[PDB]
Amino acid sequence: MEACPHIRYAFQNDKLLLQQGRLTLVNKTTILLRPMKTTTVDLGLYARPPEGHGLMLWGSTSRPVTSHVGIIDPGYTGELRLILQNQRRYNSTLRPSELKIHLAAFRYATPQPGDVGLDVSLPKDLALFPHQTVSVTLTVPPPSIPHHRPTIFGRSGLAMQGILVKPCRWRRGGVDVSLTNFSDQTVFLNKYRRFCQLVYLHKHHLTSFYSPHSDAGVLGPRSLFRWASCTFEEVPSLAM
Numbered sequence: 001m002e003a004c005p006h007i008r009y010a011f012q013n014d015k016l017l018l019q020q021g022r023l024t025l026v027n028k029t030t031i032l033l034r035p036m037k038t039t040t041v042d043l044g045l046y047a048r049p050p051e052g053h054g055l056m057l058w059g060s061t062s063r064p065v066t067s068h069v070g071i072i073d074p075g076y077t078g079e080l081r082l083i084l085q086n087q088r089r090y091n092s093t094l095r096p097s098e099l100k101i102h103l104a105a106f107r108y109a110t111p112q113p114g115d116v117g118l119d120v121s122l123p124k125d126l127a128l129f130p131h132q133t134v135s136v137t138l139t140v141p142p143p144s145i146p147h148h149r150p151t152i153f154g155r156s157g158l159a160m161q162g163i164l165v166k167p168c169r170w171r172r173g174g175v176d177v178s179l180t181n182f183s184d185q186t187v188f189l190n191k192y193r194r195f196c197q198l199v200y201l202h203k204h205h206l207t208s209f210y211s212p213h214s215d216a217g218v219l220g221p222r223s224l225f226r227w228a229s230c231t232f233e234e235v236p237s238l239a240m
């Protein structure tokens with residue numbers, strides 16, 4: 001059913017063109033990404049996830065750059081920031097128009113204000129050397145929620161250190177959470193460190209097929225993310 005209150009937002013940033021159920025910004029100037037370091041894009045963008053929903057923020061490029069896929073919580077009242085990492089050992093440049101920045105809604109449930117995800121504790125110690133990708137197997141099934149699919153997203157704090165999580169479905173036999181260290185340090189994550197977050201997405205948001213108003217970039221190679229069809233409505237007073 002069509003049950004999305006507007007997404008209220010305010011936007012101001014002369015280095016990004018607002019193009020825009022999905023808001024998209026394009027870069028106007030070249031963005032240089034240092035290697036081995038986190039690159040951050042300040043968006044000038046404020047946005048209220050409407051009732052029942054969270055927001056998903058992600059960068060899309062065909063350059064050798066990986067975006068953190070951001071979960072925006074209903075309680076978040078600040079300016080949105082995009083987190084990028086460089087796949088290469090030298091500077092990578094994003095020429096104008098090469099980077100699109102998307103924001104769109106999704107319905108979520110919370111199992112038995114108020115964050116979307118539940119942070120997940122690492123069951124083992126994990127070391128990651130510069131540029132290594134490794135996975136952590138999670139075995140114990142989370143509680144089933146009718147009409148929703150458990151999915152793993154990364155956290156921004158770890159993303160800022162250069163550790164990205166590939167978003168993925170937590171399928172009924174367990175999950176392999178892939179982490180990539182984009183930094184110049186060996187990172188040691190201690191057992192019980194909260195290393196990602198579990199989000200129960202409404203099943204409508206995951207599709208194995210090329211549907212309208214969906215995107216193959218976000219959740220992996222075998223799904224597309226299909227967002228809630230909501231209307232963005234500019235409320236400048238949100239800025240701050």
Ligand SMILES: O=c1ccn([C@H]2C[C@H](O)[C@@H](COP(=O)(O)OP(=O)(O)OP(=O)(O)O)O2)c(=O)[nH]1
Pocket residue numbers: 057068069070071072073074076079080081082083154155156157158
């Ligand atoms: O790419 C992103 C991701 C998140 N956020 C904002 C919205 C979100 O509600 C908040 C916290 O993000 P996250 O939950 O990923 O951070 P954390 O490391 O889990 O910190 P916290 O414990 O405060 O949630 O930061 C962004 O601006 N950009």
Ligand SMILES: [Mg+2]
Pocket residue numbers: 115155
């Ligand atoms: Mg969080």
